[PDB]
From a paper:
The RNA-binding protein (RBP) TDP-43 (Trans-activation response element (TAR) DNA-binding protein 43) is mislocalized and aggregated into neuronal cytoplasmic ubiquitinated inclusions in the vast majority of ALS, as well as approximately half of FTD cases. TDP-43 is a nucleo-cytoplasmic shuttling protein comprised of two RNA recognition motifs (RRMs) that bind TG-/UG-repeat nucleic acids in a sequence-specific fashion and are indispensable for its roles in RNA metabolism. Finally, TDP-43 contains an N-terminal region spanning its first 80 amino acids, whose role in the function and/or malfunction of the protein remains unclear. In this study, we provide evidence that the physiological TDP-43 state in the nucleus is oligomeric and that this oligomerization is indispensable for the functional role of the protein in RNA metabolism.
To elucidate the molecular basis of physiological TDP-43 oligomerization, we determined the crystal structure of TDP-43 NTD at 2.1 Å resolution, which revealed an unprecedented mode of head-to-tail interactions between monomers generating solenoid-like polymers. TDP-43 NTD crystallized in space group P63 and two molecules (Mol-A, Mol-B) are found in the asymmetric unit, whose structures are virtually identical, indicated by a root-mean square deviation (r.m.s.d) of 0.612 Å (Cα atoms of residues 1–80). Crystallographic symmetry generated three intertwined superhelices of TDP-43 NTDs packed against each other, building a tubular superstructure. Within each superhelix, every turn is composed of 12 TDP-43 NTD monomers (two molecules per asymmetric unit) with a rise of 24.6 Å between two asymmetric units, a helical pitch of 147.6 Å and a radius of 34 Å to the center of mass, respectively. TDP-43 NTD adopts a compact fold comprised of a five-stranded β-sheet (β2-β1-β5-β3-β4) packing against one α-helix. The head region (on the right when viewing the β-sheet with the β1-strand pointing up) of TDP-43 NTD is positively charged and interactions are made by residues mainly from β3- (Asn45), β4- (Arg52, Arg55), β5- (Asn76) strands and the β3-β4 loop (Ser48). In contrast, the tail (on the left, viewing from β-sheet with β1-strand going up) of the molecule is negatively charged and is comprised of residues from the β2- (Glu17) strand, the α1-helix (Gln34) and the β1-β2 (Glu14) and β2-α1 (Glu21) loops that interact with the adjacent molecule. In addition, at each interface, β2-strand of one monomer forms a parallel inter-molecular β-bridge with the β4-strand of the adjacent monomer in which the main chain atoms of Glu17 (β2-strand) forms H-bonds with the backbone of Met51 and Gly53 (β4-strand). This interaction is strengthened by the guanidinium groups of Arg55 and Arg52 that form salt bridges with the carboxyl groups of Glu21 and Glu17, respectively.
Author numbering: 2 to 79
Write the structure that this text describes.
Amino acid sequence: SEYIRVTEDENDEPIEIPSEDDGTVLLSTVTAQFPGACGLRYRNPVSQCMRGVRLVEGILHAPDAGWGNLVYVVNYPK
């Protein structure tokens, strides 16, 4: 039951969005601040490549380590 930081552009200051009590994040929780959003990715700090977040059935799941304080960048389609 944390907040994760989410942004639509890595330079922009992110906003915190609430997780579920189980540590997941609903896609709907994201799309209420980022309408259109279809997913998330984040900059892996060890490789500096982008890394996708798992989404199954409208539910986002944390990286194995947890969400931490990383900045999650929203994906949009097309």
